[PDB]
């Protein structure tokens, strides 16, 4: 989850101001402009920090889920669990931030493609990696990228 709410018994020492931002709970983007277009959409699963595709079908309005390829629609940069809604940056808008990488093979200067699970994998091209993949926890790898569209 984006913010796993767990109670603690001791305070965690947090004084160093470096290597503090690469975390799974840091939503949004590293650099954001006031004129960035944002859309909230109903979602299924957990597409947080992943490429999202718009799925269209009691009939319901279209929702979004993790995906990519020819069906890529945007990027989910923030999520709200109570409302079950996800803030999405459309693919027509450039973005800079940390996204989910398939594995640790991704390095700097690497051109990346959103796979069927919304994860960034090495090689149409969509983004250019800026840093190496870092393991946040278990198999979760986060990579800083500069999304620019589709080739």
């Amino acid at each position: 989850m984006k913010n796993p709410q767990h109670d603690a018994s001791l305070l965690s020492n947090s004084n160093e101001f470096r290597d503090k931002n690469v975390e799974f709970f840091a939503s949004g983007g590293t650099r954001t402009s006031k004129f960035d277009k944002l859309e909230n959409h109903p979602f299924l699963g957990y597409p947080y920090k992943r490429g999202v595709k718009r799925v269209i079908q009691s009939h319901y309005e279209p929702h979004v889920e993790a995906g990519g390829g020819e069906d890529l629609y945007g990027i989910c940069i923030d999520i709200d669990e109570f409302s079950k809604t996800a803030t999405i940056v459309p693919i027509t808008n450039n973005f800079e931030g940390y996204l989910v990488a398939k594995d640790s093979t991704v390095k700097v200067k690497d051109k990346l493609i959103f796979n069927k699970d919304g994860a960034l994998e090495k090689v149409t091209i969509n983004a250019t990696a800026l840093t190496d993949a870092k393991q946040i926890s278990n198999e979760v790898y986060l990579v800083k990228v500069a999304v620019f569209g589709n080739k």
Binding site: K37, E39, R54, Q57, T92, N93
Partner: protein
Amino acid sequence: YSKSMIENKVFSSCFKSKNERVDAYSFACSSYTDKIEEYLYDPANSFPYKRGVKLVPKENSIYVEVGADTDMYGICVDVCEFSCTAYVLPITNNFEGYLVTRNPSIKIGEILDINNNGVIIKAGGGPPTAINIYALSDSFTINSINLIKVAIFGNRGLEKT
């Protein structure tokens, strides 16, 4: 034709399904930070309202004329007939709204393409599509002009079939 289109002898007769009007507000979901541009259009060649348009630089001014997806500059969302001015949302911006189609039977979720007349058609016609267009609703006829709710988000990487 026109958008406003007239004195009536009597008034025309729930909240549901009242948006099915030719002169309805094009943007189903609007957003500030959407870029809107003004251009001139030919007042006798083709009426660009709710159609995909292309830039034609003429010897006196840059006009917008109905065009295909291959050379599309954007979508004409509104027209001021008094000044014959067309308002264009560039293709670089997202769009979700009602556009003119020529097929009266289009289902929801189908892939769509803009033809030479700036008209929504089914993407299975054969021309390789270059834009991501999806039908968000079934096509409806206003009695006659056919309209459909579509979502347009940027160009397609590799042209499809």
